[PDB]
Amino acid sequence: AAAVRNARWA
Amino acid sequence: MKRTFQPSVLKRNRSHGFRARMATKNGRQVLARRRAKGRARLTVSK
RNA sequence: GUUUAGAACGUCGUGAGACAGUUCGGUCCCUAUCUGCCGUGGGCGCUGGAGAACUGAGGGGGGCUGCUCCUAGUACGAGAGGACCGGAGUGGACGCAUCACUGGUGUUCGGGUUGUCAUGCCAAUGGCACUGCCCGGUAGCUAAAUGCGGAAGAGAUAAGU
RNA sequence: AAUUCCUUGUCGGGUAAGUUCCGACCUGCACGAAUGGCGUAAUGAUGGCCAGGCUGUCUCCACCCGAGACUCAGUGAAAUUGAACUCGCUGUGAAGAUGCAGUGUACCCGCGGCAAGACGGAAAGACCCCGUGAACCUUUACUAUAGCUUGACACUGAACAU
RNA sequence: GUAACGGGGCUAAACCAUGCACCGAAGCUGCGGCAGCGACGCUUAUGCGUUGUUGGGUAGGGGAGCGUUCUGUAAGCCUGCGAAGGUGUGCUGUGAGGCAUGCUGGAGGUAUCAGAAGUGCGAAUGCUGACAUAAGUAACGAUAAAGCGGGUGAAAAGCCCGCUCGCCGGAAGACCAAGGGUUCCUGUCCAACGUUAAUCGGGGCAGGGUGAGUCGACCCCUAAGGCGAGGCCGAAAGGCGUAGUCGAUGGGAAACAGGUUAAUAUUCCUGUACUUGGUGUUACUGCGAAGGGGGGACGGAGAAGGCUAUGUUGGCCGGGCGACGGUUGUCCCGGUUUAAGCGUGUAGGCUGGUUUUCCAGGCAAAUCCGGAAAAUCAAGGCUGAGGCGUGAUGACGAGGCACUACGGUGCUGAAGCAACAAAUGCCCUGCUUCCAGGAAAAGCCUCUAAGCAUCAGGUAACAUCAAAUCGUACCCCAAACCGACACAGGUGGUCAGGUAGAGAAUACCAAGGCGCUUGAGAGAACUCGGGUGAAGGAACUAGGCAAAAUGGUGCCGUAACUUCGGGAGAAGGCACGCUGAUAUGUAGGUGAGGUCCCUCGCGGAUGGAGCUGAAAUCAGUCGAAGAUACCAGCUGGCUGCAACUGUUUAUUAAAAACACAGCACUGUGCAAACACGAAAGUGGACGUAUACGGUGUGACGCCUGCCCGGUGCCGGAAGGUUAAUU
RNA sequence: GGUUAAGCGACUAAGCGUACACGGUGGAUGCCCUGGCAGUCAGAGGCGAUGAAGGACGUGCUAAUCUGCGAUAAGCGUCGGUAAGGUGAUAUGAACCGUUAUAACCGGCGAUUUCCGAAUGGGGAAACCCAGUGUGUUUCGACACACUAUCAUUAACUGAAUCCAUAGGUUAAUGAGGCGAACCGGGGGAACUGAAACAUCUAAGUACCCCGAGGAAAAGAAAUCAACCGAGAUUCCCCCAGUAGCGGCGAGCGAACGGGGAGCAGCCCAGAGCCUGAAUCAGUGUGUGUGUUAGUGGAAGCGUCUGGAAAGGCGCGCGAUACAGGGUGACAGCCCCGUACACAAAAAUGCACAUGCUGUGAGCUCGAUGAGUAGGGCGGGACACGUGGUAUCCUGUCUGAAUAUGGGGGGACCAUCCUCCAAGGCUAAAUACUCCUGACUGACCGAUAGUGAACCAGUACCGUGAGGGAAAGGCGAAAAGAACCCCGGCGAGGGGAGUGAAAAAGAACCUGAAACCGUGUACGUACAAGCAGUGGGAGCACGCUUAGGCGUGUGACUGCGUACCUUUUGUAUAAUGGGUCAGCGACUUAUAUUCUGUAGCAAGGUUAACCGAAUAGGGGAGCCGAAGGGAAACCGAGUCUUAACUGGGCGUUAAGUUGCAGGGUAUAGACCCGAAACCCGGUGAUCUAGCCAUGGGCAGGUUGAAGGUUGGGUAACACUAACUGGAGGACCGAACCGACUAAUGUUGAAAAAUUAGCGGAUGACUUGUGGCUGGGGGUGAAAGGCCAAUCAAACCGGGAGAUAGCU
Ligand SMILES: [Mg+2]
Ligand SMILES: [Mg+2]
Ligand SMILES: [Mg+2]
Ligand SMILES: [Mg+2]
Ligand SMILES: [Mg+2]
Ligand SMILES: [Mg+2]
Ligand SMILES: [Mg+2]
Ligand SMILES: [Mg+2]
Ligand SMILES: [Mg+2]
Ligand SMILES: [Mg+2]
Ligand SMILES: [Mg+2]
Ligand SMILES: [Mg+2]
Ligand SMILES: [Mg+2]
Ligand SMILES: [Mg+2]
Ligand SMILES: [Mg+2]
Ligand SMILES: [Mg+2]
Ligand SMILES: [Mg+2]
Ligand SMILES: [Mg+2]
Ligand SMILES: [Mg+2]
Ligand SMILES: [Mg+2]
Ligand SMILES: [Mg+2]
Ligand SMILES: [Mg+2]
Ligand SMILES: [Mg+2]
Ligand SMILES: [Mg+2]
Ligand SMILES: [Mg+2]
Ligand SMILES: [Mg+2]
Ligand SMILES: [Mg+2]
Ligand SMILES: [Mg+2]
Ligand SMILES: [Mg+2]
Ligand SMILES: [Mg+2]
Ligand SMILES: [Mg+2]
Ligand SMILES: [Mg+2]
Ligand SMILES: [Mg+2]
Ligand SMILES: [Mg+2]
Ligand SMILES: [Mg+2]
Ligand SMILES: [Mg+2]
Ligand SMILES: [Mg+2]
Ligand SMILES: [Mg+2]
Ligand SMILES: [Mg+2]
Ligand SMILES: [Mg+2]
Ligand SMILES: [Mg+2]
Ligand SMILES: [Mg+2]
Ligand SMILES: [Mg+2]
Ligand SMILES: [Mg+2]
Ligand SMILES: [Mg+2]
Ligand SMILES: [Mg+2]
Ligand SMILES: [Mg+2]
Ligand SMILES: [Mg+2]
Ligand SMILES: [Mg+2]
Ligand SMILES: [Mg+2]
Ligand SMILES: [Mg+2]
Ligand SMILES: [Mg+2]
Ligand SMILES: [Mg+2]
Ligand SMILES: [Mg+2]
Ligand SMILES: [Mg+2]
Ligand SMILES: [Mg+2]
Ligand SMILES: [Mg+2]
Ligand SMILES: [Mg+2]
Ligand SMILES: [Mg+2]
Ligand SMILES: [Mg+2]
Ligand SMILES: [Mg+2]
Ligand SMILES: [Mg+2]
Ligand SMILES: [Mg+2]
Ligand SMILES: [Mg+2]
Ligand SMILES: [Mg+2]
Ligand SMILES: [Mg+2]
Ligand SMILES: [Mg+2]
Ligand SMILES: [Mg+2]
Ligand SMILES: [Mg+2]
Ligand SMILES: [Mg+2]
Ligand SMILES: [Mg+2]
Ligand SMILES: [Mg+2]
Ligand SMILES: [Mg+2]
Ligand SMILES: [Mg+2]
Ligand SMILES: [Mg+2]
Ligand SMILES: [Mg+2]
Ligand SMILES: [Mg+2]
Ligand SMILES: [Mg+2]
Ligand SMILES: [Mg+2]
Ligand SMILES: [Mg+2]
Ligand SMILES: [Mg+2]
Ligand SMILES: [Mg+2]
Ligand SMILES: [Mg+2]
Ligand SMILES: [Mg+2]
Ligand SMILES: [Mg+2]
Ligand SMILES: [Mg+2]
Ligand SMILES: [Mg+2]
Ligand SMILES: [Mg+2]
Ligand SMILES: [Mg+2]
Ligand SMILES: [Mg+2]
Ligand SMILES: [Mg+2]
Ligand SMILES: [Mg+2]
Ligand SMILES: [Mg+2]
Ligand SMILES: [Mg+2]
Ligand SMILES: [Mg+2]
Ligand SMILES: [Mg+2]
Ligand SMILES: [Mg+2]
Ligand SMILES: [Mg+2]
Ligand SMILES: [Mg+2]
Ligand SMILES: [Mg+2]
Ligand SMILES: [Mg+2]
Ligand SMILES: [Mg+2]
Ligand SMILES: [Mg+2]
Ligand SMILES: [Mg+2]
């Protein structure tokens, strides 16, 4: 399995 | 790092053994399903 | 910093919560195929083969400047003050090369020393402990060390005469 | 002020220079007394600020020791991939071009490197919006309901006093 | 990057005004071909010099076909003179296609006209299988380290042997439990497995290997808890639970040393023991419970004392006279080991002891326990290390000679002592102390009931039997277990050598075990782990992040503030090596011989030999440096928050958050409130308001003001309003 | 000719491209079926304390596994069948047994039948542990059998409080326990979904859970319907009819009367006689008949040709109540097994008829005629019917009759009239289903299909567990499975040889495609810019032709030319999709309705169930059409509207109906794939959180509380000094535990770690072994944390193909 990171602008 | 599986024969037989399963009808229904499915190993007991 | 989940203040809301209000804490991945770029090779071509030295089409680098001195305390100015032009000297920044000097390093050189082990023992050595810890140090590499560079001069010109 | 929007408020201290810190001021945008107020020794991998020591943190990097990177031998992946005979510029164009137009440049092919671009790779976007989507949670949203509570009847009968 | 003619270039190759040419499209016209449609000429379901006209096309509508599998046609036809399938070639139709053939293959295939569909695939981050790409690139798994000679082999960096080197040594050693299940040993083999090769292996293959009265398990006994006759409850299922019955992680009988296998051993062998039952004999005889009592039987912390394990030194025995100066010496090396059991009962710990008597108590009884009195004894009893003796004229033992397959085998075999130090082990389930006040049962001991008291049974001494069954190899902080891996991770217990050190830290070593399953070169950038650094010293940066620095013991000295404890190791400073002297090895510790005493022993008092051994001072001496390495606090000042130790988002947040002691409010009278449960019941609690639950606040200090309108809560009940019911 | 100069200049291929040839990899295509799928006709619908289902371990000449079997262990006895061969399979071999009937094999009936499992002597972690009693054994150590669970029922014996009694207790007899597919009855009972939301409603009394029974079950013999005529139990089918109705009158739900069929069966008690054992039923024996469980016979061909082989070809025959099929070296009526027909049972058993016993009562007369019930109030449920004006049925609650001179019903209610007699029971058939047995069938599949499984498949494997769950078929006719030689490591692999029709069938074995990867040849390619092709085109190579030149391959050079799909106003777009190949993969099916086409009949058309030797025929029950208008009564080629229409609305000349095909619509999953979720039943506290029980661990070094003693002080204290003491969620710091900072690593050594530092380290510590709390629940010093790498509602299965106006 895995995960994600929203470093992008909100 | 300690994982989810720590072997214990006494605990394993007391939890899923033939006599533990057959004590209740719900476990006895598991045996009926496994007998109907034709499982080679009915319970976890050796 | 903003921009998650934690928490708190003020504020809003009955409340859950909310606030370009504020406070504290809080995971930034990718072994380069292609283009591009910096280097460095292989292949073939250039009309016999081969070894050298060149011409320079073309391309790139480089192009900064201060302060003193002389001109001259002259021109200018009542004075206070104070040059143009031109010529010297000495710096800053930048760049290149170099290690003679000044230094760094020099776990491959020499020495001192702690603990312990070994070489039968003593003595003398060696191993290990960050090179055990230190003191020095050749060559090399290196800068903070020291040499050099920016130009002058032409051609055609900009604005302008 | 963990609270002050205006705001880096004003004054003082600290610095060569302090939007932070410390002391005050009160003008409390929008503090406040057990959703505690103010103080408080000690404690804190607590937050902010200052000083000494200390240093390659930095001015400004140099050298050295190892492990990789490089070469040889052996074994031998991966994400990705429409197909490629996969240059620059200007312009155009589902509006930021290796592929179109024009034009320039460029012998064929490796190796070591750097990551500017291939709107690079990763994951049917978490922000925004939408669906008469989902879920939890809140309440004086709706409709109910467990529970709690009221009375009648039944279980439950007979004297007396008001 | 010229970039505002597409470019070149142009003074007309621009613009303006006239012309005549030419170029220019799938438009138009020619010359063929196909198809749709309209009214005709004859003929017309067909069709004819027809003719006119139309034919871009998504969504979509209409129409006509191809091909695939199957059924009828088809018990036909095609086919070992080569069917289907595959792979080429040729021809043909507007198309989906069709026809034929060469080769492959070796047994099916199927005309025609109808019928039926799992009837046509490039996409769906489609599904399954196969194969690419990156790519011979990354990686080959801790930087603890390897090297050589020899051997085996087809082949050796990796296997075997040997000699060095390096690593661990509170582990990276040894022994277990749990867990695994043969991985153990031997032989054999190198496909696959091993991140390379491999002769090797935890790989393949074939054999062998696990021996118990005493170790465990089983067994007896109970804890939490489970199950649970009857029982209670619940639509059914079922839930709870009594008597009971299970359930160790706990309590209960007994074995040690030596030797031995390729692999097992407190299990086999040797030697020497022990225990519980059964049976028999003999003697003496009150036995007896589903009963009673005792016992089992229990905390934390701390303090020593007595010991042993163990270590050191000396002595003794054996060996050595040194590859290079010295080494017959106070020299060097090695050894100096012995259990359970039995006897003694020691240091020490605990308790007064012994009779008689009574008694509504211990569910009845009791001779026991618990009570009441009286007498008399100055003791007695219990427990317990260790030592010593025995075990043991034995075993073991350096070494020795002979044989032999490097093993080995056989024989022999000296000394086998003392002092000192010393545990975290033992005495100790003790002692002392504290509050938070620290299992059970059975075995065991004792007491009597009923039921026997000739008997049985009990006690004692012999003899004798019996002690079954199961586990036992091996790994067990790891390549064998948990992590997909021969995985830098995790995993409980036991053992605890030397030097230095307070120490189980740390460094170097012993025993023992390893060098981590790809290497060999090269010595770029860059990256990682480190070393050093002129001068400056936080100018860096959000921030002294990181690094550097500090670091020990003794002594001196130490502020604000404080809850008087602290702050405090505050800060700051001084002394540390070696040698000698005091004092040839001191103070101290230990303590033999000897000499007295004993109602006599493991005795007491003297006594000081011999060992062990700081600390200080003085003097000398070496270095730049003596806490020299490793190891090992940076410090101070102001301030916010939280009192504090603690807890928390396993896997980006350890905080000011949560908890917290304390405080207050409120509920709760015990069949308590409350909570879990359709209920029974259970928790609360075997507690009782000095208690419990809920809520908020959050040590401590000083304090906590005003509002009851709103919303809740509490109390009242006259009136208004109001359900079922009648 | 030589020397210069200028111009031009092929030949090079490290490699690459295209074409062709030859291979490798791979297992598609085709062919095949001892496997599946759907059915038809029958049978059989249970097994079990006489120990089941399902297993464990054993058992052979046996090393493993499979299949059998159970210590009598691939088997023993007996009775039949049958027999010349035979000791199950992988799977040979060895050692043997048989051959005319005790080899073997098949069937009937027995014997044996370890251990676990309802499991039953007790216990237990299933295949293990521990007994008691009694009988019988003796080698005095022991040994062998038997019995000993619980509950229900019955009968004995004993036996409390408590005098009898009763409860209770002890025996002894019977019975029940469990397993199993669907169908059936009953007790409980969803949600997703639909309503384009969502409450009533729908889904649905479905899924699921629980209880019980049978081969069927259930229902069942009118207090029923009808309507003034009548019908006459129940069940099932076709109609009636998507009608009447129900319904936020929305979605949707949905009869009955009556008719046509299948099949029909009626009785008993509520009581006594007169008769009498009557009919009938059940037990059982006793035969017959017909099955079942082994079996027997079963017709008829040769020659020649091709070919490895004949069943094929070409000839000439023969059988057929047998030309159903299978096998045999290619396609067999006559080769083989069978098939059609004709036969068979020692023993067991089914079915049916008859008969004998054991029960069982038939008939007649006179009586009797189901009361806390009907009904009612309240609250619900069931009837198509949701409270509505709601009859009828069931009742949680509260009441409560009449009783034949009486009650019930006739869809509110009343009267009248019909009809029936509740409050006690029994009852076959027609109906539903298939775990299982046998035979047969298919415009069903043919190894990615068909069961998940054609193969040692519910296996390997995954998960703690519930549970999930694969991949994998083909040599040839016969293994004749390659003797021997050679290379190699006493290998692997390969070359010969040999076998065979073929090895171009060699076990990596039928056919062997494509992607992909090679070797060879031809051509092109090292000054050349881009979807890589197209139009033109030299040259070279090559095949034909005869010089007409065509054909093939390559292609210098040149004009033109920015992939495909999806989604869009618009994509070369720097928007989505795709590494490639092969295989698979999406508009179907059922019913109804409308329309079109077509066929038949026609003012008619046509049947459905069912019957039926049965695609025929029967059955016209019904359905549509020929007449409409109106709300309806009604009227009618008219009718309604209105008082009435000269009117107006709707109708009146116009052919339909039944098949078949097709286009739509409707209900079902409805073209395929995809949610996050909701609901139901289970599995998880071997991880983690808390708690419970029982054990363990915490080197070393400091600080020095209370208290105590001894002084000083006080009248005594207090106070003070010294010395003892050893207090603490005390200090420093290893083990141990935590995880604050930074670096590395992030296709990890590791799906959270390592290195250097960091905090705690006698406690609210830490740890071992057990135990307990379970999913709207747990647990939580509280973060929405944790509850098996998953948590704002775990996991598994089911509803389920939820739904998806979206892609
Ligand atoms: Mg921030
Ligand atoms: Mg940060
Ligand atoms: Mg970081
Ligand atoms: Mg980065
Ligand atoms: Mg030099
Ligand atoms: Mg150096
Ligand atoms: Mg030595
Ligand atoms: Mg070293
Ligand atoms: Mg120097
Ligand atoms: Mg100039
Ligand atoms: Mg000039
Ligand atoms: Mg000018
Ligand atoms: Mg501000
Ligand atoms: Mg200021
Ligand atoms: Mg301030
Ligand atoms: Mg406030
Ligand atoms: Mg308050
Ligand atoms: Mg702070
Ligand atoms: Mg400082
Ligand atoms: Mg290096
Ligand atoms: Mg790949
Ligand atoms: Mg490109
Ligand atoms: Mg552009
Ligand atoms: Mg490269
Ligand atoms: Mg980069
Ligand atoms: Mg909207
Ligand atoms: Mg023209
Ligand atoms: Mg045209
Ligand atoms: Mg067919
Ligand atoms: Mg062909
Ligand atoms: Mg063949
Ligand atoms: Mg299809
Ligand atoms: Mg390589
Ligand atoms: Mg690469
Ligand atoms: Mg590499
Ligand atoms: Mg390694
Ligand atoms: Mg070697
Ligand atoms: Mg070492
Ligand atoms: Mg093995
Ligand atoms: Mg081994
Ligand atoms: Mg090999
Ligand atoms: Mg092995
Ligand atoms: Mg023994
Ligand atoms: Mg044993
Ligand atoms: Mg023991
Ligand atoms: Mg119970
Ligand atoms: Mg019971
Ligand atoms: Mg135990
Ligand atoms: Mg104590
Ligand atoms: Mg000793
Ligand atoms: Mg010498
Ligand atoms: Mg004593
Ligand atoms: Mg062992
Ligand atoms: Mg061993
Ligand atoms: Mg593993
Ligand atoms: Mg551990
Ligand atoms: Mg350094
Ligand atoms: Mg410096
Ligand atoms: Mg310096
Ligand atoms: Mg700064
Ligand atoms: Mg720091
Ligand atoms: Mg301080
Ligand atoms: Mg502040
Ligand atoms: Mg975290
Ligand atoms: Mg953290
Ligand atoms: Mg608080
Ligand atoms: Mg008030
Ligand atoms: Mg109030
Ligand atoms: Mg076929
Ligand atoms: Mg809806
Ligand atoms: Mg039956
Ligand atoms: Mg026959
Ligand atoms: Mg009646
Ligand atoms: Mg009633
Ligand atoms: Mg009602
Ligand atoms: Mg109404
Ligand atoms: Mg209504
Ligand atoms: Mg009603
Ligand atoms: Mg396959
Ligand atoms: Mg083949
Ligand atoms: Mg060229
Ligand atoms: Mg072209
Ligand atoms: Mg498409
Ligand atoms: Mg694109
Ligand atoms: Mg893609
Ligand atoms: Mg029609
Ligand atoms: Mg008919
Ligand atoms: Mg009719
Ligand atoms: Mg009219
Ligand atoms: Mg249709
Ligand atoms: Mg549809
Ligand atoms: Mg502490
Ligand atoms: Mg502390
Ligand atoms: Mg934690
Ligand atoms: Mg990093
Ligand atoms: Mg893993
Ligand atoms: Mg500490
Ligand atoms: Mg929770
Ligand atoms: Mg939150
Ligand atoms: Mg989790
Ligand atoms: Mg939910
Ligand atoms: Mg599920
Ligand atoms: Mg559904
Ligand atoms: Mg779906």
Swiss-Prot record, chain B:
It holds the Pfam family Ribosomal_L34. Belongs to the bacterial ribosomal protein bL34 family. One of its GO terms (cellular component) is cytosolic large ribosomal subunit. PROSITE patterns: RIBOSOMAL_L34 (PS00784). One of its GO terms (molecular function) is structural constituent of ribosome. Disulfide bonds: none annotated. Keywords: Ribonucleoprotein, Ribosomal protein. This is Large ribosomal subunit protein bL34. The gene is rpmH. One of its GO terms (biological process) is cytoplasmic translation. InterPro entries: Ribosomal_bL34 (IPR000271), Ribosomal_bL34_CS (IPR020939). Part of the 50S ribosomal subunit. It comes from Escherichia coli (strain K12).
